Amino acid sequence: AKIGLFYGTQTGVTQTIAESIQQEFGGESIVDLNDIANADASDLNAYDYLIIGCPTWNVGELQSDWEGIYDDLDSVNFQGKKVAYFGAGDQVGYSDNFQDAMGILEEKISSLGSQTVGYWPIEGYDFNESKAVRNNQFVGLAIDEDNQPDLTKNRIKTWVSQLKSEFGL
Numbered sequence: 001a002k003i004g005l006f007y008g009t010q011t012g013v014t015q016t017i018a019e020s021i022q023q024e025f026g027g028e029s030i031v032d033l034n035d036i037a038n039a040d041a042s043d044l045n046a047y048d049y050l051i052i053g054c055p056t057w058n059v060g061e062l063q064s065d066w067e068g069i070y071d072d073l074d075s076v077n078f079q080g081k082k083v084a085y086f087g088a089g090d091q092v093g094y095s096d097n098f099q100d101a102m103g104i105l106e107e108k109i110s111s112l113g114s115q116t117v118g119y120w121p122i123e124g125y126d127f128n129e130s131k132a133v134r135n136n137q138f139v140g141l142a143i144d145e146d147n148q149p150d151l152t153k154n155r156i157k158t159w160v161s162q163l164k165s166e167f168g169l
């Protein structure tokens with residue numbers, strides 16, 4: 001598969017989202033699914049297209065597995081790669097840090113030469129601050145199973161549909 005999806009999860013929500021995304025793209029022949037806990041930063045070198053999934057924890061912090069590999073990202077050559085992002089979060093309980101992890105990873109990875117694709121509009125959400133917002137759009141798909149579980153299915157479908165174009169599909 002030409003697309004590599006790497007996710008991190010604490011309670012399993014980001015994993016479920018990741019599995020749905022793979023399914024929407026067309027299955028394992030289209031998208032390789034990997035838990036970042038079982039990977040090396042160098043594993044990211046193999047793809048032209050990447051999808052990064054990471055939930056935010058403990059007030060604007062990266063999920064533990066992403067935190068662990070964070071300093072190793074500098075060794076990956078992101079030049080020429082197109083990267084999309086997604087994350088699970090809680091806009092009500094953490095309105096001042098909603099989807100912060102997604103924003104932290106995007107800032108790092110994009111500064112290393114990659115091009116971010118898959119921006120998502122902020123309509124329908126209610127939050128105060130987020131490090132994942134640029135030009136009034138999220139840098140990736142913001143899922144909220146804690147407060148908006150009924151919107152998830154459609155959010156994934158629409159986002160994947162828009163992504164296909166960007167990933168030469």
Ligand SMILES: Cc1cc2nc3c(=O)[nH]c(=O)nc-3n(C[C@H](O)[C@H](O)[C@H](O)COP(=O)(O)O)c2cc1C
Pocket residue numbers: 008009010011012013014015055056057058059060061063088089090091094097098099100145146
């Ligand atoms: C104690 C605690 C702190 C959290 N901190 C944040 C936060 O700062 N920002 C946010 O958007 N969500 C935050 N969340 C919400 C989680 O990201 C959300 O529950 C998500 O579904 C967890 O996904 P996981 O199963 O993939 O780890 C927090 C959740 C808990 C329980």
